[PDB]
Design a binder for these strands. Structure first.
Ligand SMILES: [Cl-]
Ligand code: NA
Lengths: 1292, 97
RNA sequence: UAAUUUCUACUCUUGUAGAUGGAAAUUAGGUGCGCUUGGCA
DNA sequence: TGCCAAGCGCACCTAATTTCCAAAAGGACTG
DNA sequence: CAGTCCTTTT
């Protein structure tokens, strides 16, 4: 049978380790003498200047190709339409095929293999493309064929700075292939054109069509917008939304024009913005007329296109020019301030506002657009002023006050500019005072700011704050002046209008200044960055192989449990390359690694045999075999059969499984497969690097199903590591003469005083060089290691000064933390600087604190107070396995069917908890449940919330923002740790919400980290040879590829829909079945009431019972009949009950919305109240519902229905009280209503816990349905109805 | 101490009155003289003496302005510049302060 | 209120516990501020 | 205590997805 | 050239 310990060595996992390098002997001196750090820093800067210049080549060529593109998009449109309407696998595969067709068509323009062009252009293109990813960039040929464009001397100086060193760009080359690729990859121009933007552009066409059909008036409105924007003059609005035009939307310039048709164009701040289509639509919806509803019911928002890869963005909107220095902003603003002084704006403004005290307030108007801003400023609420205006006008109407008249008044207030006399009359003299007070403040602060002198730089935050407040004050005055409606439509006092407009014009630059100052001041300062080291070796540390040591300059050593990196630089003088001679292992010295690798057979074999030039040149005009002798102890035969096998016309090769899919030649497949493997074995037997490799463990060629299976077994044999001893003399002299740079590879696990557990990464590294691993490779050392230099980034400041005492964050408990609010007090107290008497709570903790005097000076941020050499080195684990797994989920599912006792860990994002776990057994009973707001005695939820608020505050205060991703990782690392221990201890499935069905970041980040961890899980404590140790990692999730490609299962991890997991009774499965949106009138509520069979009082219990059949009130339901035909809904007597800990609560309590804040509500009590007010007999046990209905009192009906809705509100929250409970309105089989307030640990302790519990239980649904299934295939999602039916049947 | 009346409404008795804002003043604790000629200390308050928890038999003379000067100088806050003190008082969340 | 390849939390311990896939390229989005036209009874 | 919709501009922070993780063939230099 | 060492490849 299967076993949990059988989840290992299923696929390769690559990782990077990071270390510090400590130079030894005269290494640092030689590095300094040779001036390598400066040289490598200079390369880095040259790379950064050059990259944009070189990028100009790609950007131009790409646009030149994309301007010529003319495709027909109908077929792709159709495939999209098929797969959308019918959701099958065959329609998908058709779209995937079509997608790939369209991509290749776009790509054909780049490579010069498109029929839509002439032979001359296709010849020119292929010629350019042939040189885009080589050093042909740096020669000028590709720029010679592209235009008569040319480069400035400085640009040529840069290009020649990478002479004999163009390989520094060999990664860049890959990044740029990723732009021009035809593959289905995000980085690529074709993908962007085909799978990103075209769907959008298609959808836009559809939206346009449907809109102008429903509402043909829009056609011209849209055309008019285009006229007003001044783009696409020769193209009518119809053509813009036709497929052929999409051929004109492949270049950035045109995409931005398209986007601004949707988007509109802003001018200077304060001026009217030109509206685009999407705004015109929004405006039309917000009118709430008939045209609005028609539009609101359709799709009413065009989708902007994504940008073209690499291309610079353009905008027709106004861009404000930047300040360049502290000095420039201070001068400008200082001048503007002086202008405002000499102009006499504050004294005019004050005189203007005074004018208001004794002038006809009928001839002063307030802008309709500002009425609500003024309300907030001068009144309790934003609607105060409107409402007072409304109510006053209503009171002034003549005749019987119809509803239409009130309607008319409301409509008048939307547009009309209101005079100040009316505003005052409606709101009261209070308003006059609030106005005068506010104008005083704004003038007072403005005056203060003009008098207050400016700082000398903006280098300190205190200085930026001086700048900010002065701008704030001036902006305040600008805002105040902009309160007044000044236009000549209203009968404004002529003087007032002229004077206001005058000082408004003088104040207008405040806007411009405010924005520019912010845009400058909130810039982040150049922080120092580590840069790559090369030591004058273009292929430095590219790969470790003995045969490459003389080119790549990097070797490894071991000596007395310590690890060293050997770098062999190219010095400035003439020196013979350094050679190392082994000796007897007894002699003192360093053990040097001899690394022996033949990379991926699949590529290297053809590279060294079939794909040779001489081979290709021979088979071009010959059919006779060719025998290779060079690097072969005996000659290797290349026959035409073999050559043509790896070099076909046909798209799939005859030995790839794709030829088996495409055709039906299983004979010829396996025959081609055998002959190729045979040939590989012939190569391996003869080639110099492989001939001595024992391949007897390989099987006979004929027994391999796929080529991958073969290469999977082969590659593990083609890598070996051994050590030989070099004498101390050779090494020390090499260091002495500067022919060797020797560094200790270091982390804190190598400290003299290290005496604890090592970092996981240390364990990987030591496991890598362990004897077991050398004999049978589990961990491989990979090439492409990198060395970095990181300059000091902080100043040395010891966290101490003299005889300071340091206060442990935890008590002698070594468990209980000191409150955040008390720490500084206790800290200042134990260092005798409190400045006041100690608080009572501090004085209570005082006896259990721990202090440590400072004997040894430890440096804050020490690691960053001096330059460091860093080293990144990649490794691969589970090396014996294939590179990707096969049918990983099936293997888990197989294991699960044979292990029905498997427990489930539900994980939930909560409302009051970041993450909440509930572990269930295989019978759906809770083993454990807890919030993970606190781990290791630290409240991460509080720390995170505080840091998020700081970051907002920073943003608003033009202060340094900083990062929160580090704190998030800190937290999630602890969480991941605890989930991993639970999984291992329980051998359990883990179940999370699918987020496709706020604080969704912290949970998304979790998902990622959890999977990455479970892809390769090593537990420090476990021995190396035990499953879960370093040489046998656990692999419990499927190999992560992308979130895009992720399904509802990744091994032991499962995703389930969140709906109906929190607001659901744990004992019955009951959910509120009603849609309260559809209960809105006296009519709807009364039909709703008529649907219930009875409501009657039970004198025994004190409860009311309301009987409902699920087949009634369908109009008001969500179409989820679940499993139960009826429910007795219960109004619980509002009596005292006691929880497990002995704390009381009131049964049946609800917490309902107020929005003042929430209100306590006792339904049963309130029902009795209603019935007693109405005088309706109920204590006999009679049906109350006919009597409420026959009476036909609408307020009694409303109340009753309001009460029903409350009773059905299971979840009841109040942050203030910390209540967040579930109380079910229905009795379980044993005749009791669930209440989390009882604090029974068998059940959910709160609402968030209930969530996790049902997350877990949805997983259980998947495991139960898997068992019953005869496949190893998990069902695709869970419909809400299936869920409810499941859980309701189970519980009852 | 400036208070807008359309503010901190959670602690108000719901009696806005007529005025929008008040400049609450901590009067300097200097000597003033009544008409008869008797001296008194301006700004003086008479507050119950409180023993731990809730115990109040006798009363005591308090001088708010001077005690504020004490509290600021304790914590090294500069105030004779005319600068706003409120942000500085709650910038570090000192419970005593 | 300190030590780290680096991060978070710690300090019996000149260090502890857990985590940690790098580099390069690209793209998408978020938060904040400013502004525009509108909406809310 | 006022938010919300559609959108334009600026600052910076965060996340997702691609390539590589190489010895040796190939050939541009450089006396 | 013949060798060296950066460039490019499967
Ligand atoms: Cl829910
Ligand atoms: Na450790």
């Amino acid at each position: 049978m299967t076993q949990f310990e059988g989840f290992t060595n299923l696929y390769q996992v690559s990782k990077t380790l990071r270390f510090e390098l400590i130079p030894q002997g005269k290494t640092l001196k030689h590095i300094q003498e040779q001036g390598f750090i400066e040289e490598d820093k200079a390369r880095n800067d040259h790379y950064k200047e050059l990259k944009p210049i070189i990028d100009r080549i790609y950007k131009t060529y790409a646009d030149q190709c994309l301007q010529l593109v003319q495709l027909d998009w109908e077929n792709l449109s159709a495939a999209i339409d098929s797969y959308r309407k019918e959701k099958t696998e065959e329609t998908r595969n058709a779209l995937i095929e079509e997608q790939a067709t369209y991509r290749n068509a776009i790509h054909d323009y780049f490579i010069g293999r498109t029929d839509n062009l002439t032979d001359a252009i296709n010849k020119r293109h292929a010629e350019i493309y042939k040189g885009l990813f080589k050093a042909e960039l740096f020669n000028g040929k590709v720029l010679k064929q592209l235009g008569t464009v040319t480069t400035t001397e400085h640009e040529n100086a840069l290009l020649r700075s990478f002479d004999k060193f163009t390989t520094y760009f060999s990664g860049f080359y890959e990044n740029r292939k990723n732009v021009f690729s035809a593959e289905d990859i995000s980085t690529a121009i074709p993908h962007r054109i085909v799978q990103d933007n075209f769907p959008k552009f298609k959808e836009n066409c559809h939206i346009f069509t449907r809109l102008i059909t429903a509402v043909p008036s829009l056609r011209e409105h849209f055309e008019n917008v285009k006229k007003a924007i001044g783009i696409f003059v020769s193209t009518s609005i119809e053509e813009v939304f036709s497929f052929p035009f999409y051929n004109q939307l492949l270049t950035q310039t045109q995409i931005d024009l398209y986007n601004q048709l949707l988007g509109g164009i802003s001018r200077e701040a304060g001026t009217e913005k030109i509206k685009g289509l999407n705004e015109v639509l929004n405006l039309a919806i917000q009118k709430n007329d008939e045209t609005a509803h028609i539009i609101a019911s359709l799709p009413h928002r065009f989708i902007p296109l994504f940008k073209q890869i690499l291309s610079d963005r353009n905008t027709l909107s106004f861009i404000l020019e930047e300040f360049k220095s502290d000095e420039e902003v201070i001068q400008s603003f200082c001048k503007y301030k002086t202008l405002l002084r000499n102009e006499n704006v504050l004294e005019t403004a004050e005189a203007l506002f005074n004018e208001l005290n004794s002038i006809d307030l009928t001839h002063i108007f307030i802008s309709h657009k500002k009425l609500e801003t003024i309300s907030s400023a001068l009144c309790d609420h934003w609607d105060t002023l409107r409402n007072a205006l409304y109510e006053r006008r209503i009171s002034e109407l003549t005749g019987k006050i119809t509803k239409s008249a009130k309607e008319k008044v409301q409509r008048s207030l939307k547009h009309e500019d209101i005079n100040l006399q009316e505003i005052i009359s409606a709101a009261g003299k209070e308003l006059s005072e609030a106005f005068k007070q506010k104008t005083s403040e704004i003038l007072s602060h403005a005056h203060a700011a003009l008098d207050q002198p400016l700082p000398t730089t903006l280098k300190k935050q205190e200085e930026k704050e001086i700048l900010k407040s002065q701008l704030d004050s001036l902006l305040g005055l600008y805002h105040l002046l902009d309160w007044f409606a000044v236009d000549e439509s209203n009968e404004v006092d002529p003087e007032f209008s002229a004077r206001l407009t005058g000082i408004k014009l003088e104040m207008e630059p405040s806007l411009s200044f405010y924005n520019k100052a912010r845009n400058y001041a909130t810039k982040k300062p150049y922080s120092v960055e580590k840069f790559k080291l090369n030591f004058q070796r273009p292929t430095l540390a590219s790969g470790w192989d003995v045969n490459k040591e003389k080119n790549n300059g990097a070797i490894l050593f071991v000596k007395n449990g310590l690890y060293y990196l050997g770098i062999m630089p190219k010095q400035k003088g003439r020196y013979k390359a350094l050679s190392f001679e082994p000796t007897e292992k007894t002699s003192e010295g360093f053990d040097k690694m001899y690394y022996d690798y033949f990379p991926d057979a699949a590529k290297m074999i053809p590279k060294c045999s079939t794909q040779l030039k001489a081979v290709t040149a021979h088979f071009q005009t010959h059919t006779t075999p060719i025998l290779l002798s060079n690097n072969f102890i005996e000659p290797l035969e290349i026959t035409k059969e073999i050559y043509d096998l790896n070099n076909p016309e046909k798209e799939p090769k005859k030995f790839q499984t794709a030829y088996a899919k495409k055709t039906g030649d299983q004979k010829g497949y396996r025959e081609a497969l055998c002959k190729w493997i045979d040939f590989t074995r012939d190569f391996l037997s003869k080639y110099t690097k492989t001939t001595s490799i024992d391949l007897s463990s390989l099987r006979p060629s004929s027994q391999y199903k796929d080529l991958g299976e073969y290469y999977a077994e082969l590659n593990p044999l083609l890598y070996h590591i051994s050590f030989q001893r070099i004498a101390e003399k050779e090494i020390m002299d090499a260091v002495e003469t500067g022919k060797l740079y020797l560094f200790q590879i270091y982390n804190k696990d190598f400290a003299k005083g290290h005496h604890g557990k090592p970092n996981l990464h240390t364990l990987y590294w030591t496991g890598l060089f362990s004897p077991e691993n050398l004999a049978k490779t589990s961990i491989k050392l990979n090439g492409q290691a990198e060395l970095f230099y990181r300059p000091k980034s902080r100043m040395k400041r010891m966290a101490h000064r003299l005889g300071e005492k340091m206060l442990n964050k935890k008590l002698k408990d070594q468990k209980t933390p000191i409150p955040d609010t008390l720490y500084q007090e206790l800290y200042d107290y134990v260092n005798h600087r409190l400045s006041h008497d100690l608080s009572d709570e501090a004085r209570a903790l005082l006896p259990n604190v721990i202090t440590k005097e400072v004997s040894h000076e430890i440096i804050k941020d020490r690691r960053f107070t001096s330059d460091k050499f860093l080293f990144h080195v990649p490794i691969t684990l589970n090396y014996q396995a294939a590179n990707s797994p096969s049918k990983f989920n099936q293997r888990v599912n197989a294991y699960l069917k044979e292990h029905p006792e498997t427990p489930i860990i539900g994980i939930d994002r909560g409302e009051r908890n970041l993450i909440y776990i509930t572990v269930i057994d295989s019978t759906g009973k809770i083993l454990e449940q807890r919030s993970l707001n606190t781990i290791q005695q630290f409240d991460y939820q509080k720390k995170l919330d505080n840091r998020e608020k700081e970051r907002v505050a920073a943003r608003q205060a033009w202060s340094v923002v900083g990062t929160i991703k580090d704190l998030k990782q800190g937290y999630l690392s602890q969480v991941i740790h605890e989930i991993v221990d639970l999984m291992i201890h329980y051998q359990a499935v883990v179940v999370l919400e699918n987020l496709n069905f706020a604080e969704k970041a912290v949970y998304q980040q979790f998902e990622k980290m959890l999977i990455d961890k479970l892809n390769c899980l090593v537990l420090k404590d476990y021995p190396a040879e035990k499953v879960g140790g370093v040489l046998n990692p656990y692999q419990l999730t499927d190999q992560f590829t992308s979130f895009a490609k992720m399904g509802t299962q990744s091994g032991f991890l499962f995703y389930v829909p969140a709906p109906y997991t929190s607001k659901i009774d744990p004992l019955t499965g009951f959910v509120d079945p009603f849609v309260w949106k559809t209960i809105k009138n006296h009519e709807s509520r009364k039909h709703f009431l008529e649907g219930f069979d009875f409501l009657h009082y039970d004198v025994k219990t004190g409860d009311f019972i309301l009987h409902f059949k699920m087949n009634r009130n369908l109009s008001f339901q969500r179409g989820l009949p679940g499993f139960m035909p009826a429910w007795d809904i219960v109004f619980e007597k509002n009596e005292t009950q006691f929880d497990a800990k002995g704390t009381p609560f009131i049964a049946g309590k609800r917490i309902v919305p107020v929005i003042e804040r929430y209100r306590d509500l006792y339904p049963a009590n309130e029902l009795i109240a209603l019935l007693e007010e109405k005088g309706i007999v109920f204590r006999d046990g009679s049906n109350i519902l006919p009597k409420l209905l026959e009476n036909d009192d609408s307020h009694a009906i409303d109340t009753m229905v309001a009460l029903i809705r409350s009773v059905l509100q299971m979840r009841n929250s109040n942050a203030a009280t910390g209540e967040d409970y579930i109380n079910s309105p229905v009795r379980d089989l044993n005749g009791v209503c669930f209440d989390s307030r009882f604090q029974n640990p068998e059940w959910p302790m709160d609402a968030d816990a209930n969530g996790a519990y049902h997350i877990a239980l949805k997983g259980q649904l998947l495991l139960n349905h898997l068992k019953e299934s005869k496949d190893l295939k998990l069902q695709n999602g869970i419909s809400n109805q299936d869920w409810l039916a499941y859980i309701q049947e189970l519980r009852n | 101490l400036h208070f807008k009346m359309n503010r901190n409404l959670s602690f108000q008795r719901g009696l806005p009155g007529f005025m929008p804002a008040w400049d609450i003043v901590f009067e300097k604790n200097e000597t003033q003289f009544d008409a008869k000629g008797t001296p008194f200390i301006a700004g003086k308050r008479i507050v119950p003496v409180i023993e731990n928890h809730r115990f109040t038999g006798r009363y005591r003379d308090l001088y708010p302005a001077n005690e504020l000067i004490a509290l600021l100088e304790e914590k090294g806050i500069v105030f004779r510049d005319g600068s706003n003190i409120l942000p500085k008082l709650l910038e570090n969340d000192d419970s005593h302060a």
